[PDB]
Design a protein around this nucleic acid. Structure first.
Lengths: 210, 147
RNA sequence: UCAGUAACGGCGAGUGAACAGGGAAGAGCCCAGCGCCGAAUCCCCGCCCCGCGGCGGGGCGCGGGAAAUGUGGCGUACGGAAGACCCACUCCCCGGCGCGGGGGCCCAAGUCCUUCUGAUCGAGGCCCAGCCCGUGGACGGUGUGAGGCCGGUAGCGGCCCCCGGCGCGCCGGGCCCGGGUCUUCCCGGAGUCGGGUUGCUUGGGAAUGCAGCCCAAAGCGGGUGGUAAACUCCAUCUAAGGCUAAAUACCGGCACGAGACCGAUAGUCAACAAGUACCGUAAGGGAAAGUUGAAAAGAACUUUGAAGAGAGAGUUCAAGAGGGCGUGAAACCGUUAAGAGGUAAACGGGUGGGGUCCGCGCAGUCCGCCCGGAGGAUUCAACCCGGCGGCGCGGUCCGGCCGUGCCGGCGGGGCGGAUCCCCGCUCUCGGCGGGGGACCGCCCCCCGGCCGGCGACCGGCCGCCGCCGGGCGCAUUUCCACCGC
RNA sequence: GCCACGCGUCCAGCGCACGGGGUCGGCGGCGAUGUCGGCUACCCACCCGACCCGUCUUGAAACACGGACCAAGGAGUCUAACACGUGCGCGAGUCGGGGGCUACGAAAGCCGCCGUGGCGCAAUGAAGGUGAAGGCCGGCCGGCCGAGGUGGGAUCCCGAGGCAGUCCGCCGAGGGCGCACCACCGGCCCGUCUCGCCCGCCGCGCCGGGGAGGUGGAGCACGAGCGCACGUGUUAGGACCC
RNA sequence: CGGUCGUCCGACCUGGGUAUAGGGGCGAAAGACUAAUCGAACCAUCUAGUAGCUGGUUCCCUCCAAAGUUUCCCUCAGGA
RNA sequence: AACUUUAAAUGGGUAAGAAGCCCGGCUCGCUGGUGUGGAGCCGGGCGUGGAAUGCGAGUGCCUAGUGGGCCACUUUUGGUAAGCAGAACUGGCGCUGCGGGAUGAACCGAACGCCGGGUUAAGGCGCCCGAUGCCGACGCUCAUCAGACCCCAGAAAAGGUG
RNA sequence: AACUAGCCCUGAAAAUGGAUGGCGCUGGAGCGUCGGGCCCAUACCCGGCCGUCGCUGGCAGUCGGCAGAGCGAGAAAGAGAGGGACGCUACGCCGCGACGAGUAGGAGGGCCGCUGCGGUGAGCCUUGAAGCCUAGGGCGCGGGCCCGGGUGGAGCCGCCGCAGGUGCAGAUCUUGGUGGUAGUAGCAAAUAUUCAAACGAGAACUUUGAAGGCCGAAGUGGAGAAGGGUUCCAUGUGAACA
RNA sequence: ACCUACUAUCCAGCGAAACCACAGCCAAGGGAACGGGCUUGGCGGAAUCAGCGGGGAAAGAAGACCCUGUUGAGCUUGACU
RNA sequence: CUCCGGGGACAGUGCCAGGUGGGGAGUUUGACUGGGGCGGUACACCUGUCAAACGGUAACGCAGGUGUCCUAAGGCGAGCU
RNA sequence: AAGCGGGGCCUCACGAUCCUUCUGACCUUUUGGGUUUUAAGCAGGAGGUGUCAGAAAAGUUACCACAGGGAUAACUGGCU
RNA sequence: CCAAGCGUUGGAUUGUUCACCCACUAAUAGGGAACGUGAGCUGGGUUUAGACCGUCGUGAGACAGGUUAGUUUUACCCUAC
């Protein structure tokens, strides 16, 4: 029985919902359990960073988010091939690798290679055995300065580039943004019909000539 | 606060604020929105016009990410950049118009709702309205398309 | 979060996802097939050596068997195999031995003086260490209320055992390994996909998913691209084989800690010999029921009665706590005292009478001001000294401090800015990220100049006033005590 | 009988009281073992009134139903959603609620380069889409004024006047700027209908758009929401209880 | 329970064992019996099933104060 | 009542000023012998506030309960009639006690905080039972079924040389 | 002689005994027309008290040797300058008028009441807490509350906020206890008991003897099965049952 | 009409249950239309025993007869699926 | 070289499709009504009256009509009564 | 010609959602793009719910059951 | 006309109320008290469940249409006598 003025409501409570009720009193205790396991993991990998392997620079799909940059699943094989790192050896030195990723662009391919170049410089590699330091390991003084890195290793900051104030030229002054937007709207809509119209129009010229 | 509720003042009253003829029964009118084409017809027409029926085209797999095109008016166009750039724009004698990138702040379309101050601009946006362009050109600015 | 959205729904009630984004966590891999290696593989039994509560490894078997109807190594879509040319280290891993968690035992300080009580853990005190300890003043017990009586508590406190561990060293050991360039090859899962039909299901709507029947594949192939179909471009994976921890759930079980929860008709049915007594043939149903006292000190003994039951006596602080016993209400009943009683009883208003205890009433008010006279003081006003406080427009004294005030800067810093040379990298100049420098703005500080204040916030000097303390002053001053009816 | 007391020029204290709500500057008795007082609450007597409560009902004391008596328990609660009103903080912004970092403490604090995301800041159309003032001057261009008007409008402003002669403040006929808000007329945005004149490009048409007049919109026209708490009301839930 | 009654050599009575179990059994047929329960046995669960229908709904004081009327509803004991 | 030439009472609209009159002038794409007509805009001048009486008004949200009614004067429908059923105006009961009608939902009067004094309404003043225990006025009436107060609780035609 | 109008009579007959309300009334205590006087409801007037509403009233002016004691005034505006009682929890205090019904229902105020939590009272307490009883003193309109007395033996309360499983007379309410009925209905199906002795505190019911009876071999006899499960036997008891 | 047995009666002993708003003398009136309570009258006297069936619209069971419910069940069919 | 015979690519089984199918399952069986049922529609409209001189106004009140029909029985113009 | 007419001189002769059908367009979508069927949209008519603000609907119970109703009947009592 | 003081019967039939007949008589008048009277009696009929017949309905079943058999509980409470 509705009142004078109000909404039409659809409460989804017609099932036996009282049996399946999830309380959240575990949340303050869960946060301690997440923290204690995270701190215990960090002491297990005490020289290695707590975040883990590095993540690539990733553009978003779904054009709503297409101007944003995230941290990804792993570096592509094309990005590792340019950087000169074998795919089975990068995983032991803290590089996330996945074979699913593609490389359609060159800017993002070069950005991750540049990201991999600065990671190799910042990586302090311990020798396999302390008695015999090998060729590709760090120097002896870098052993004493090896420390844990808190937070995400090399955080991916969506940096924006500043631009200086320019003097407007005549091409920018006389440009018609609305007219160009309306015109490109029509030609994309009318691309197929004009192509079809020019298709059979050749056979009306052939039949006229013959 | 149960002490502030109505039930504390209703102690000693037989009908408990529900009447003696029309007793507070369980469901006299039916559960939920019962009787739309029936005994609750008037309430469904005098307060919710258009409730019953279908209109428009169905769209099976709709993604809200595709239709994301946020708009900004010409009122809060100079609020996107800092106030320091607005002072130096009118102060500069060379006429160097500052660039306001609409996509950078998180909008795609520009609408010509408001008045623009008389100093040139360079507006980079994903989309423009017709009236928004003439207001920018009326000040002596430029509309720059970007994707 | 998308989202009560797309969507489904006698489009009614109602039902109702998914993508993307931010987080927790984050680990990848193995076969068949294709091929190369002389079955190069594996199980059992017997022997040796070494540990043997997980019979483990290695060695020997003209010892047996499995396996050519295919085991093992390389090898899995991210490509892989073989050959030629460069580069590069050859050292990874099994069965042995010797070099913090759990449990157990302990660790501070009053029973100190007086005083209540049946008992103190109740009250006062313990000055100059306002008793003593405190990294210990959580809790519980002890004859009401205890940090110091005790168990405990705190402590990176002490002592004694068990557990594998982390790394070192020795030997039994397998262990000769890959990466880049060029050339030649190879490569994929079938009554399976898919289609028709039917049924169930889903938000999935000309079947989203699952299943029965029928048809039934292909290799520049196949699937998907949320409307059925044809043509043509693309986009994205490689199904019909398999393994894999973490974030996640947990009304059962083990051991815990805690509560703005309930307090024996409450809280689990069950605080107790509770799933017990009891009921039904059975499936099953299913209770009620806590409290003497601090300590039994549980009433010795005398007497009546056959005894149950009493009367004395005794214990206790209290039997008015006497064995289903703390406190013992109402309905109901018995007895004592008072009152009353032929319109059932009871009630409201107004009186009157009688009881009940109370007013502790039984000679009815004191308080101020003035007068009288009897007294008794170390006593008044006024001066001197010291301290304190208030105020001041001190017409504006001097000095500090601040500004939820401003200005100035051959100023400095710390920052921020969507204002404008150098270090590094992908193609010495053009592009890119980062660090200057300059400029602007904010804050802080060095100050300096005004304004305001010290009454949300100040001190010293001066003036005035008030108070207190001490000297005098000394009795027509001042202060106490007594009565007039 | 009189709410009548002076001159010339021109045409104040003392008392009394039918007086802004009562005082006595008036009295008499009795009060220690039998006297005083004690509304109410203990009992009894009389007069008047007076049918046993709850509930259904137009109508109950009913020959309408429940009801021997007493003790305990015993019935609008909790979650979610929404609407309105109020209080608080911020404000075109607001918010960690999810996640991280530092006995009571499972608390509290911190992290916005953890604001992703929720609501608002823009609506309209089924959708493709579109998407929020104009006027003047000079010759479609170049300058200027630049955010609608009318009526009613609490409040604020001026001062003809008036409280020998200036200042303060007072009020004041009358004249204005007009807050919020109401009524109306206009203006702008989207869809639809009708009518035209036209212009123009990167691919000159069955093209792209403007204009004028009606009409529909939960729109604009110098913001008002966000978060928390409280109360009421309607629901889905066992849903005030049997 | 008493008196009075039908039958009492056959379609007679009866013990034990066994078989038929609930929309089922079985019935010389009465909707009879199926553990004192039968026009669908008993136990547990869904379930605290729904009820426009009865009953009840707990402290005081102050202030304000009704309606049994319009329209619609398979609406007439009810709702908007 | 479903006829009407006439035709009331009661009743139902509107007006009794400042948003009203009287001027002057602009605009219109509306209408056109004609600045014709109309409408809208402005500017100006007129306050004795233009009937009586009474009263502070206007406006926005949220919202319970109610949706079985009944009775009374007058009008009226069906029914012989009904404490019957169905309507119109207004007032009551429901929701409300108080005084009176012996009693009483609807009648008469009058509505309510707790009291003292006074005075009344409707009703009454032989006793119950407060009040005529007035030197009450004028007449009528004898019942062997007298009569006695709205609602209202009982009576007719007819007849009587009472 | 015919009409007509009053009071009275006939018309006029129902069942328990019977109602102008009763008693009763006839120079009315009946009827009609009417006078004075009298009776009184919560109705009206005056006066006291409580509360509500309105004046959206008044009070910071407690302005004192730095002083001057005022805004009760019919008349738009200025007592303008060249050693001393109370008060004012401003959510407080004070003054005027008007009003006070109430079902369903709504709102407000509770220094009304219960339970627990954070603060707070240098709170109460074995020289006596909670609970319970009370013929006492009282307060508040009221919900209720404080003292006095008795019992009791170990906890409890006031104020500011917070929170709820927070107030009973009923629901043929649930649990438990107790009444009238009531020392009442009843201890009546199947013929019957009597005397003496023993024992015992106690004999109608126990034991023994005797007498009189019944079951009358299809039994009230003697043994089984199912079922019961120590009921079978000896001793003792008269606590509970018979 | 009379006789017998067991009761019913009383006593020794033991001893409940249904029911119970409060409780119970009537006439008339009105009332929700048949009162024990209200009004006007008649009147009214402790405590009880054995019967008795006029009254308490007596006790027994939320009328099964009638109707409503948008409540059901057994059964039938030319009802719908 | 089928154990003997008898059938036999037909029985029969699985999946669809059509018929039949109260044997069985679920559900329904309107409302108003001087009780209900039966009869009628007062259930949707219109005319006069009820209706009390604005309007509105009830009953299973009274008298009646309706779910149509018209290529004109519509729309003008002309001429007649 | 002034004029009159968007039905019948007036007071009456008719129908929501959903679904289907037809018509109208140089209209929108059919989903990664293009073409064409098809399908979904916008607007305007029609196919009807007469219980006419619009459920898809036969009986019987004497074997009956439940919540109720003196709002409603059979009996007594009341009014006529 | 006064007159309810006192009487108003026994039987056949039918459950009957009513009704008719036989006989006697002084007459065989009419009625009320919840259509007096079921915790006073009876269960004959209406009016359950079992059945038979006639009519109707396809059917389950219906019949103010007949026939048959079909549990009549409780005072010990108060008042009245």
């Amino acid at each position: 029985a509705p009142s004078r003025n109000g909404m039409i409501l659809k409460p989804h409570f017609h099932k036996d919902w009282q049996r399946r009720v999830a309380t959240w009193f575990n949340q303050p205790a869960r946060k301690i359990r997440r923290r204690k396991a995270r701190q215990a993991r960090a002491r297990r990998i005490a020289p290695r960073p707590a975040a883990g392997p590095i993540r690539p620079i990733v553009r978003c799909p779904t054009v709503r988010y297409h101007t944003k940059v995230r941290a990804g699943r792993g570096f592509s094989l094309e990005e590792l091939r340019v950087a000169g790192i074998h795919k089975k050896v990068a995983r032991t030195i803290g590089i996330s690798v996945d074979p699913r990723r593609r490389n359609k662009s060159t800017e993002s391919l070069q950005a991750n290679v540049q990201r991999l170049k600065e990671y190799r410089s910042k990586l302090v590699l311990f020798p396999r055995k302390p008695s015999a330091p090998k060729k590709g390991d760090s120097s002896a003084e870098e052993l004493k300065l090896a420390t844990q890195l808190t937070g995400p290793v090399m955080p991916i900051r969506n940096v924006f580039k500043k631009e200086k104030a320019r003097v407007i030229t005549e091409e920018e002054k006389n440009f018609k943004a609305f007219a160009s937007l309306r015109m490109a709207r029509a030609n994309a809509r009318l691309f197929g019909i004009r192509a079809k119209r020019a298709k059979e129009a050749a056979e009306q010229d052939v039949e006229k000539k013959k | 606060p149960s002490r502030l509720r109505k039930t504390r003042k209703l102690r000693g009253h037989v009908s408990h604020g529900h009447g003696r003829i029309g007793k507070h029964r369980k469901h006299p009118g039916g559960r939920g929105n019962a009787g739309g084409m029936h005994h609750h017809r008037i309430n469904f027409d005098k307060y919710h016009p258009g409730y019953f029926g279908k209109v428009g085209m169905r769209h099976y797999h709709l993604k809200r990410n595709q239709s994301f095109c946020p708009t900004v008016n010409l009122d809060k166009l100079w609020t996107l950049v800092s106030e320091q750039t607005r002072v130096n724009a009118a102060k500069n004698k060379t006429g160097a118009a500052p660039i306001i990138d609409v996509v950078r702040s998180g909008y795609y379309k520009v609408l010509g709702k408001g008045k623009l101050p008389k100093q040139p601009v360079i507006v980079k946006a994903k989309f423009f309205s017709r009236r928004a362009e003439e207001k920018i050109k009326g000040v002596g600015g430029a509309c720059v398309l970007v994707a």
